[PDB]
Design a protein around this motif. Structure first.
Motif, PDB file in Angstrom:
ATOM      1  N   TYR A  47     -18.342  -7.681  -3.840  1.00 38.04           N
ATOM      2  CA  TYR A  47     -16.989  -7.656  -3.371  1.00 38.04           C
ATOM      3  C   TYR A  47     -16.118  -8.232  -4.468  1.00 38.04           C
ATOM      4  CZ  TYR A  47     -13.464 -10.993  -1.697  1.00 38.04           C
ATOM      5  OH  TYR A  47     -12.369 -11.812  -1.574  1.00 38.04           O
ATOM      6  N   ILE A  48     -16.763  -9.039  -5.321  1.00 36.90           N
ATOM      7  CA  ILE A  48     -16.132  -9.668  -6.471  1.00 36.90           C
ATOM      8  C   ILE A  48     -15.766  -8.598  -7.475  1.00 36.90           C
ATOM      9  CG2 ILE A  48     -17.079 -10.691  -8.646  1.00 36.90           C
ATOM     10  CD1 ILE A  48     -15.914 -12.263  -5.428  1.00 36.90           C
ATOM     11  N   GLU A  49     -16.614  -7.590  -7.549  1.00 35.96           N
ATOM     12  CA  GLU A  49     -16.384  -6.483  -8.440  1.00 35.96           C
ATOM     13  C   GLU A  49     -15.226  -5.688  -7.911  1.00 35.96           C
ATOM     14  OE1 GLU A  49     -20.094  -4.849  -9.869  1.00 35.96           O
ATOM     15  OE2 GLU A  49     -20.401  -6.966 -10.377  1.00 35.96           O
ATOM     16  N   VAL A  50     -15.364  -5.192  -6.686  1.00 32.29           N
ATOM     17  CA  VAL A  50     -14.270  -4.477  -6.071  1.00 32.29           C
ATOM     18  C   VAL A  50     -13.078  -5.427  -5.978  1.00 32.29           C
ATOM     19  CG1 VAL A  50     -14.860  -5.039  -3.680  1.00 32.29           C
ATOM     20  CG2 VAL A  50     -13.534  -2.972  -4.172  1.00 32.29           C
ATOM     21  N   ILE A  51     -13.378  -6.735  -6.033  1.00 31.45           N
ATOM     22  CA  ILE A  51     -12.356  -7.755  -6.003  1.00 31.45           C
ATOM     23  C   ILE A  51     -11.649  -7.781  -7.351  1.00 31.45           C
ATOM     24  CG2 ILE A  51     -12.754 -10.206  -6.708  1.00 31.45           C
ATOM     25  CD1 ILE A  51     -10.868  -9.461  -4.199  1.00 31.45           C
ATOM     26  N   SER A  52     -12.420  -7.541  -8.414  1.00 30.98           N
ATOM     27  CA  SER A  52     -11.867  -7.497  -9.751  1.00 30.98           C
ATOM     28  C   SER A  52     -11.042  -6.231  -9.921  1.00 30.98           C
ATOM     29  CB  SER A  52     -12.976  -7.540 -10.798  1.00 30.98           C
ATOM     30  OG  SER A  52     -12.591  -6.876 -11.989  1.00 30.98           O
ATOM     31  N   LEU A  53     -11.432  -5.195  -9.184  1.00 30.46           N
ATOM     32  CA  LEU A  53     -10.756  -3.915  -9.239  1.00 30.46           C
ATOM     33  C   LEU A  53      -9.598  -3.853  -8.249  1.00 30.46           C
ATOM     34  CD1 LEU A  53     -14.088  -1.911  -8.950  1.00 30.46           C
ATOM     35  CD2 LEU A  53     -13.369  -3.564 -10.689  1.00 30.46           C
ATOM     36  N   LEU A  54      -9.593  -4.762  -7.275  1.00 31.18           N
ATOM     37  CA  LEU A  54      -8.550  -4.783  -6.264  1.00 31.18           C
ATOM     38  C   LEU A  54      -7.248  -5.383  -6.784  1.00 31.18           C
ATOM     39  CD1 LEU A  54      -9.592  -5.438  -2.589  1.00 31.18           C
ATOM     40  CD2 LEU A  54      -8.695  -3.408  -3.751  1.00 31.18           C
ATOM     41  N   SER A  55      -7.320  -6.602  -7.303  1.00 35.43           N
ATOM     42  CA  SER A  55      -6.137  -7.286  -7.816  1.00 35.43           C
ATOM     43  C   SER A  55      -5.340  -6.400  -8.771  1.00 35.43           C
ATOM     44  CB  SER A  55      -6.544  -8.581  -8.517  1.00 35.43           C
ATOM     45  OG  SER A  55      -6.633  -8.406  -9.920  1.00 35.43           O
ATOM     46  N   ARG A  56      -6.016  -5.440  -9.393  1.00 35.38           N
ATOM     47  CA  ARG A  56      -5.359  -4.533 -10.329  1.00 35.38           C
ATOM     48  C   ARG A  56      -5.402  -3.092  -9.834  1.00 35.38           C
ATOM     49  NH1 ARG A  56      -9.136  -0.920 -12.110  1.00 35.38           N
ATOM     50  NH2 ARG A  56      -7.846  -0.718 -13.996  1.00 35.38           N
ATOM     51  N   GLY A  57      -6.357  -2.799  -8.967  1.00 34.35           N
ATOM     52  CA  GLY A  57      -6.512  -1.452  -8.436  1.00 34.35           C
ATOM     53  C   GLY A  57      -5.303  -0.954  -7.664  1.00 34.35           C
ATOM     54  N   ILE A  58      -4.938  -1.679  -6.610  1.00 39.02           N
ATOM     55  CA  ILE A  58      -3.806  -1.289  -5.771  1.00 39.02           C
ATOM     56  C   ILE A  58      -2.523  -1.149  -6.596  1.00 39.02           C
ATOM     57  CG2 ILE A  58      -4.623  -3.385  -4.551  1.00 39.02           C
ATOM     58  CD1 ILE A  58      -1.899  -3.603  -3.243  1.00 39.02           C
ATOM     59  N   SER A  59      -2.516  -1.731  -7.791  1.00 40.68           N
ATOM     60  CA  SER A  59      -1.361  -1.642  -8.676  1.00 40.68           C
ATOM     61  C   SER A  59      -1.673  -0.751  -9.881  1.00 40.68           C
ATOM     62  CB  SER A  59      -0.947  -3.036  -9.151  1.00 40.68           C
ATOM     63  OG  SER A  59      -1.767  -3.477 -10.218  1.00 40.68           O
ATOM     64  N   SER A  60      -2.957  -0.455 -10.075  1.00 43.24           N
ATOM     65  CA  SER A  60      -3.409   0.378 -11.172  1.00 43.24           C
ATOM     66  C   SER A  60      -3.107   1.840 -10.900  1.00 43.24           C
ATOM     67  CB  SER A  60      -4.912   0.192 -11.393  1.00 43.24           C
ATOM     68  OG  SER A  60      -5.432   1.205 -12.239  1.00 43.24           O
ATOM     69  N   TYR A  61      -2.852   2.163  -9.636  1.00 41.15           N
ATOM     70  CA  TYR A  61      -2.563   3.537  -9.240  1.00 41.15           C
ATOM     71  C   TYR A  61      -1.281   4.074  -9.890  1.00 41.15           C
ATOM     72  CZ  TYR A  61       1.496   2.885  -6.210  1.00 41.15           C
ATOM     73  OH  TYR A  61       2.763   2.647  -5.736  1.00 41.15           O
ATOM     74  N   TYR A  62      -0.425   3.185 -10.399  1.00 43.96           N
ATOM     75  CA  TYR A  62       0.826   3.629 -11.018  1.00 43.96           C
ATOM     76  C   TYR A  62       0.557   4.587 -12.187  1.00 43.96           C
ATOM     77  CZ  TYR A  62      -0.360  -0.887 -13.247  1.00 43.96           C
ATOM     78  OH  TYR A  62      -1.011  -1.954 -13.826  1.00 43.96           O
ATOM     79  N   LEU A  63       0.613   4.086 -13.424  1.00 42.53           N
ATOM     80  CA  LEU A  63       0.369   4.907 -14.607  1.00 42.53           C
ATOM     81  C   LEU A  63       1.153   6.226 -14.540  1.00 42.53           C
ATOM     82  CD1 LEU A  63      -2.994   6.725 -14.190  1.00 42.53           C
ATOM     83  CD2 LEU A  63      -2.387   4.884 -12.621  1.00 42.53           C
ATOM     84  N   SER A  64       0.472   7.366 -14.665  1.00 40.39           N
ATOM     85  CA  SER A  64       1.144   8.661 -14.621  1.00 40.39           C
ATOM     86  C   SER A  64       1.475   9.076 -13.185  1.00 40.39           C
ATOM     87  CB  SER A  64       0.271   9.730 -15.281  1.00 40.39           C
ATOM     88  OG  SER A  64       0.519   9.802 -16.675  1.00 40.39           O
ATOM     89  N   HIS A  65       1.133   8.227 -12.220  1.00 37.46           N
ATOM     90  CA  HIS A  65       1.407   8.516 -10.817  1.00 37.46           C
ATOM     91  C   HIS A  65       2.315   7.446 -10.215  1.00 37.46           C
ATOM     92  CE1 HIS A  65      -0.053  10.220  -6.776  1.00 37.46           C
ATOM     93  NE2 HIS A  65       0.454  11.220  -7.474  1.00 37.46           N
ATOM     94  N   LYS A  66       3.578   7.452 -10.631  1.00 41.38           N
ATOM     95  CA  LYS A  66       4.553   6.483 -10.142  1.00 41.38           C
ATOM     96  C   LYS A  66       4.797   6.649  -8.645  1.00 41.38           C
ATOM     97  CE  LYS A  66       6.792   7.214 -14.596  1.00 41.38           C
ATOM     98  NZ  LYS A  66       7.858   6.620 -15.449  1.00 41.38           N
ATOM     99  N   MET A  73       0.999  -2.878   0.403  1.00 39.97           N
ATOM    100  CA  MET A  73       0.416  -2.220  -0.756  1.00 39.97           C
ATOM    101  C   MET A  73       0.764  -3.024  -1.999  1.00 39.97           C
ATOM    102  SD  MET A  73      -1.456   0.216   0.111  1.00 39.97           S
ATOM    103  CE  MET A  73      -2.662  -0.853  -0.667  1.00 39.97           C
ATOM    104  N   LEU A  74       0.799  -4.337  -1.812  1.00 39.03           N
ATOM    105  CA  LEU A  74       1.127  -5.274  -2.875  1.00 39.03           C
ATOM    106  C   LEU A  74       0.659  -6.677  -2.496  1.00 39.03           C
ATOM    107  CD1 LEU A  74       3.751  -6.006  -5.249  1.00 39.03           C
ATOM    108  CD2 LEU A  74       4.273  -7.169  -3.095  1.00 39.03           C
ATOM    109  N   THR A  75       0.706  -6.982  -1.200  1.00 37.28           N
ATOM    110  CA  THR A  75       0.287  -8.282  -0.702  1.00 37.28           C
ATOM    111  C   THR A  75      -1.226  -8.411  -0.747  1.00 37.28           C
ATOM    112  OG1 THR A  75       1.589  -9.653   0.824  1.00 37.28           O
ATOM    113  CG2 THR A  75      -0.302  -8.589   1.782  1.00 37.28           C
ATOM    114  N   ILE A  76      -1.909  -7.291  -0.632  1.00 39.72           N
ATOM    115  CA  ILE A  76      -3.355  -7.300  -0.659  1.00 39.72           C
ATOM    116  C   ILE A  76      -3.850  -7.668  -2.052  1.00 39.72           C
ATOM    117  CG2 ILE A  76      -5.362  -5.747  -0.675  1.00 39.72           C
ATOM    118  CD1 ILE A  76      -2.685  -4.924   1.769  1.00 39.72           C
ATOM    119  N   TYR A  77      -3.475  -6.875  -3.046  1.00 39.56           N
ATOM    120  CA  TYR A  77      -3.872  -7.154  -4.421  1.00 39.56           C
ATOM    121  C   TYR A  77      -3.437  -8.559  -4.800  1.00 39.56           C
ATOM    122  CZ  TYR A  77       0.131  -7.363  -7.673  1.00 39.56           C
ATOM    123  OH  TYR A  77       1.224  -7.762  -8.408  1.00 39.56           O
ATOM    124  N   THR A  78      -2.228  -8.911  -4.391  1.00 43.41           N
ATOM    125  CA  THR A  78      -1.691 -10.229  -4.664  1.00 43.41           C
ATOM    126  C   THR A  78      -2.542 -11.278  -3.959  1.00 43.41           C
ATOM    127  OG1 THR A  78       0.528 -11.158  -5.053  1.00 43.41           O
ATOM    128  CG2 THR A  78      -0.075 -10.815  -2.794  1.00 43.41           C
TER     129      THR A  78
END
Length: 111
Positions: A47-66, A73-78
């Motif tokens: 969960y630490i892994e998905v946890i490492s991917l979560l803090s940035r994942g939910i916000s990593s979706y941006y990039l070319s997909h604004k 959809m911000l409080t979770i990663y936060t």
């Protein structure tokens, strides 16, 4: 999951139901799939892994997909980062696993 991952997870479910997440199947589906990843919090390292991917994942979706980002959809990663900093997560492990990963640390948290 335990309590730590419980509210972050529960928040995930609560969020995934976010009307502006429902529309974003990719956002809800990830929260969903991820949600299931929390259940097995017993595998906090996992969960630490998905946890490492979560803090940035939910916000990593941006990039070319604004997009926008509906509250839940911000409080979770936060929260994920707060859990970390707050000592809810065994960041000691994440610390070891993050080393081997060379991940981020999103210091722009928009609470």
């Amino acid at each position: 999951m335990d309590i730590k991952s419980q509210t972050l997870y529960l928040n995930l479910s609560e969020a995934y139901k976010d009307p502006e997440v429902k529309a974003n199947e990719f956002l809800s589906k990830l929260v969903v799939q991820c949600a299931g990843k929390l259940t097995a919090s017993n595998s906090e390292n996992s969960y630490i892994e998905v946890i490492s991917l979560l803090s940035r994942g939910i916000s990593s979706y941006y990039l070319s997909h604004k997009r926008i980002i509906p509250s839940s959809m911000l409080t979770i990663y936060t929260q994920i980062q707060k859990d970390i900093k707050n000592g809810n997560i065994d960041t000691e492990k994440l610390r070891k696993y993050e080393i081997a990963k060379g991940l981020m640390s999103v210091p722009y948290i928009y609470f």
